[PDB]
Design an enzyme around this catalytic site. Structure first.
Site, PDB file in Angstrom:
ATOM      1  N   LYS A   1     -66.946 -84.179  76.235  1.00 11.99           N
ATOM      2  CA  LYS A   1     -65.962 -84.365  77.438  1.00 11.99           C
ATOM      3  C   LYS A   1     -66.251 -85.204  78.066  1.00 11.99           C
ATOM      4  O   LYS A   1     -65.396 -85.753  78.956  1.00 11.99           O
ATOM      5  CB  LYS A   1     -65.830 -82.751  78.252  1.00 11.99           C
ATOM      6  CG  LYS A   1     -64.813 -82.603  79.285  1.00 11.99           C
ATOM      7  CD  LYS A   1     -64.925 -81.320  79.810  1.00 11.99           C
ATOM      8  CE  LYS A   1     -63.810 -80.981  80.702  1.00 11.99           C
ATOM      9  NZ  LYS A   1     -63.862 -79.731  81.415  1.00 11.99           N
TER      10      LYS A   1
ATOM     11  N   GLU B   1     -58.488 -77.064  86.104  1.00 16.93           N
ATOM     12  CA  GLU B   1     -59.232 -75.999  86.391  1.00 16.93           C
ATOM     13  C   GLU B   1     -59.096 -75.245  87.403  1.00 16.93           C
ATOM     14  O   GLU B   1     -59.288 -74.259  87.619  1.00 16.93           O
ATOM     15  CB  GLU B   1     -61.105 -76.587  85.738  1.00 16.93           C
ATOM     16  CG  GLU B   1     -60.811 -76.764  84.397  1.00 16.93           C
ATOM     17  CD  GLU B   1     -62.157 -77.945  84.001  1.00 16.93           C
ATOM     18  OE1 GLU B   1     -62.827 -78.224  85.005  1.00 16.93           O
ATOM     19  OE2 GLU B   1     -62.169 -78.256  82.889  1.00 16.93           O
TER      20      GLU B   1
ATOM     21  N   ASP C   1     -60.912 -72.584  78.134  1.00 20.90           N
ATOM     22  CA  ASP C   1     -61.401 -73.357  79.245  1.00 20.90           C
ATOM     23  C   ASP C   1     -62.278 -74.126  78.182  1.00 20.90           C
ATOM     24  O   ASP C   1     -63.568 -73.704  77.790  1.00 20.90           O
ATOM     25  CB  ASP C   1     -62.331 -72.484  80.167  1.00 20.90           C
ATOM     26  CG  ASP C   1     -63.047 -73.289  81.042  1.00 20.90           C
ATOM     27  OD1 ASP C   1     -63.020 -74.596  80.895  1.00 20.90           O
ATOM     28  OD2 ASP C   1     -64.114 -72.773  81.491  1.00 20.90           O
TER      29      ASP C   1
ATOM     30  N   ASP D   1     -67.053 -75.172  92.244  1.00 23.86           N
ATOM     31  CA  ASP D   1     -67.530 -74.972  90.827  1.00 23.86           C
ATOM     32  C   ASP D   1     -68.708 -75.653  90.337  1.00 23.86           C
ATOM     33  O   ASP D   1     -68.799 -76.952  90.417  1.00 23.86           O
ATOM     34  CB  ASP D   1     -66.297 -75.784  90.094  1.00 23.86           C
ATOM     35  CG  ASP D   1     -66.253 -75.686  88.485  1.00 23.86           C
ATOM     36  OD1 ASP D   1     -67.351 -75.165  87.979  1.00 23.86           O
ATOM     37  OD2 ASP D   1     -65.663 -76.435  87.852  1.00 23.86           O
TER      38      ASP D   1
HETATM   39  N1  ADP Z   1     -76.751 -65.898  85.129  1.00 23.63           N
HETATM   40  C1  ADP Z   1     -76.591 -66.962  85.342  1.00 23.63           C
HETATM   41  N2  ADP Z   1     -77.438 -67.448  86.238  1.00 23.63           N
HETATM   42  C2  ADP Z   1     -77.538 -68.826  86.342  1.00 23.63           C
HETATM   43  N3  ADP Z   1     -77.032 -69.905  85.561  1.00 23.63           N
HETATM   44  C3  ADP Z   1     -76.265 -69.262  84.528  1.00 23.63           C
HETATM   45  C4  ADP Z   1     -75.915 -67.849  84.656  1.00 23.63           C
HETATM   46  N4  ADP Z   1     -75.179 -67.701  83.500  1.00 23.63           N
HETATM   47  C5  ADP Z   1     -74.798 -69.035  82.917  1.00 23.63           C
HETATM   48  N5  ADP Z   1     -75.302 -69.909  83.769  1.00 23.63           N
HETATM   49  C6  ADP Z   1     -75.480 -71.476  83.720  1.00 23.63           C
HETATM   50  O1  ADP Z   1     -74.127 -71.934  83.825  1.00 23.63           O
HETATM   51  C7  ADP Z   1     -73.981 -73.234  83.163  1.00 23.63           C
HETATM   52  C8  ADP Z   1     -72.669 -73.267  82.172  1.00 23.63           C
HETATM   53  O2  ADP Z   1     -71.703 -73.012  83.020  1.00 23.63           O
HETATM   54  P1  ADP Z   1     -70.309 -72.803  82.517  1.00 23.63           P
HETATM   55  O3  ADP Z   1     -69.286 -72.621  83.744  1.00 23.63           O
HETATM   56  O4  ADP Z   1     -70.212 -71.572  81.572  1.00 23.63           O
HETATM   57  O5  ADP Z   1     -70.052 -74.098  81.650  1.00 23.63           O
HETATM   58  P2  ADP Z   1     -69.308 -75.473  81.865  1.00 23.63           P
HETATM   59  O6  ADP Z   1     -69.847 -75.880  83.047  1.00 23.63           O
HETATM   60  O7  ADP Z   1     -69.467 -76.413  80.763  1.00 23.63           O
HETATM   61  O8  ADP Z   1     -67.655 -75.235  82.073  1.00 23.63           O
HETATM   62  C9  ADP Z   1     -75.104 -73.311  82.276  1.00 23.63           C
HETATM   63  O9  ADP Z   1     -75.902 -74.204  83.027  1.00 23.63           O
HETATM   64  C10 ADP Z   1     -75.863 -71.887  82.304  1.00 23.63           C
HETATM   65  O10 ADP Z   1     -77.212 -71.940  82.104  1.00 23.63           O
HETATM   66 CA    CA Z   2     -66.162 -76.017  83.791  1.00 29.13          CA
HETATM   67 NA    NA Z   3     -66.503 -73.534  80.766  1.00 28.58          NA
HETATM   68 NA    NA Z   4     -68.116 -78.336  87.234  1.00 28.36          NA
END
Ligand code: ADP
Ligand code: CA
Ligand code: NA
Ligand code: NA
Ligand code: CA
Length: 380
Positions: free
Chosen positions: A69, A173, A8, A197
């Site tokens: 990205k 996704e 991912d 998402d």
């Molecule tokens: N326990 C949590 N509570 C709140 N936000 C969280 C938590 N764990 C991760 N995040 C937030 O999730 C976001 C990243 O999301 P993720 O889905 O891992 O990546 P991406 O959006 O790049 O695919 C960041 O803003 C991170 O701080």
């Molecule tokens: Ca994502």
């Molecule tokens: Na991710």
């Molecule tokens: Na997203």
């Protein structure tokens, strides 16, 4: 035969998984983290990827690349690129109408295509998996947003090829998230699945109709600029004002102080998803002054209330575009690290009148989970 991996490749974070021992395994990195920042830093002596890269962003902002990205598969003159550039601390240049990130590396000025920056992130994900498997990985399934066009998908696939991976397939996704929950196995007719998402930098709502393993994207909606980054920013503004009340000093113009505060705010935010309070203690934040304070979950929710509520309109729009009502949605799937926020879950559940939320798989790992499943299927 070596196992294929599911990657991912997210805007802010990346995740890697592999189907082995009859189950999916989300692989933790060297720091023990199941997700790795989509960051790449260039210094006078080395190239840092992941945790090491994001960890020194305050020290080396101009040479720490992220958001690749947002540039991948796009032309330099693309309105999106022209707008995004204005917010980045790193330089973006034109190379035959193709954007390239320009940085300083080992004393020289270098420029890299977005796919090259992403290949570095993918190489790190591939090595994270190899360290776990004990052998080299050659095959992988990489995911992309449902709205990605042919250029963006090609460039993403190229990033994988550069990383030394045979890209078995590029899948959407939301579809990967569905596969993670086994929703691809839909018995007796069509089923509507809504993927909610909320990640680190983007918000996506997708409505899929699954008719016996065959997926169809009925509608997509969201905000490519709404994500956890925004909630961190709300906390930053709050503490900057608090530092003013308590120290009569404004740290807003000190880039390193603001970046360090942001880092502590993201950490406190994560804690608030499991606790009702979080302490924030920063050593020498500004002019030798330590900032030891705290924040409650309620306070955090108040600071971000409007942003949390804004996520429901794209859900309403998607339902309207798919010509479906709330009751016609069979499953609600949470994706993205930000969906871990209790208030966000409450808003979605309340909007769907008490409906269950599929959240047994860590939201920030669901897409990689589904990609790993699909990779295994394609390998036979
Ligand atoms: N326990 C949590 N509570 C709140 N936000 C969280 C938590 N764990 C991760 N995040 C937030 O999730 C976001 C990243 O999301 P993720 O889905 O891992 O990546 P991406 O959006 O790049 O695919 C960041 O803003 C991170 O701080
Ligand atoms: Ca994502
Ligand atoms: Na991710
Ligand atoms: Na997203
Ligand atoms: Ca934003």
């Amino acid at each position: 035969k070596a196992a294929a991996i599911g990657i991912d490749l997210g805007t802010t974070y990346s995740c890697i998984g592999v189907f082995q021992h009859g189950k999916v395994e989300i692989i933790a990195n060297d720091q023990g983290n199941r997700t790795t920042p989509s960051y790449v830093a260039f210094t006078d002596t080395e190239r840092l990827i992941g945790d090491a890269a994001k960890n020194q962003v305050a020290l080396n902002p101009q040479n720490t690349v992220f958001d690749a990205k947002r540039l991948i598969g796009r032309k330099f003159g693309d309105p999106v690129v022209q707008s995004d550039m204005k917010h980045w601390p790193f330089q973006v240049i034109n190379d035959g109408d193709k954007p390239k990130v320009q940085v300083s590396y080992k004393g020289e000025t270098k420029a890299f295509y977005p796919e090259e920056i992403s290949s570095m992130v993918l190489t790190k994900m591939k090595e994270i998996a190899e360290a776990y498997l004990g052998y080299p990985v050659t095959n992988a399934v990489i995911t992309v947003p449902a709205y990605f066009n042919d250029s963006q998908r090609q460039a993403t696939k190229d990033a994988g090829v550069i990383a030394g991976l045979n890209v078995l397939r590029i899948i959407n996704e939301p579809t990967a998230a569905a596969i993670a929950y086994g929703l691809d196995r839909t018995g007796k007719g069509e089923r509507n699945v809504l993927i909610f998402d909320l990640g680190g930098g983007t918000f996506d709502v997708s409505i899929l109709t699954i008719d016996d393993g065959i997926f169809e994207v009925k509608a997509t909606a969201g905000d490519t600029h709404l994500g956890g980054e925004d909630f961190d920013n709300r906390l930053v503004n709050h503490f900057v004002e608090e530092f003013k009340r308590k120290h009569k000093k404004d740290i807003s113009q000190n880039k390193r102080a603001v970046r360090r505060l942001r880092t502590a705010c993201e950490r406190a935010k994560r804690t608030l998803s499991s606790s009702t309070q979080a302490s924030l203690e920063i050593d020498s934040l500004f002019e030798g002054i330590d900032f030891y304070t705290s924040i409650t979950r309620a306070r955090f929710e108040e600071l971000c209330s409007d942003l949390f509520r804004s996520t429901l309109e794209p859900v309403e729009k998607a339902l309207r575009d798919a010509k479906l009502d709330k009751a016609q949605i069979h499953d609600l799937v949470l994706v993205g690290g930000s969906t871990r926020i209790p208030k966000v879950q409450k808003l979605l559940q309340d909007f769907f009148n008490g409906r269950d939320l599929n959240k047994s798989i860590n939201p920030d790992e669901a897409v990689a989970y589904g990609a790993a499943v699909q990779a295994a299927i394609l390998m036979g």
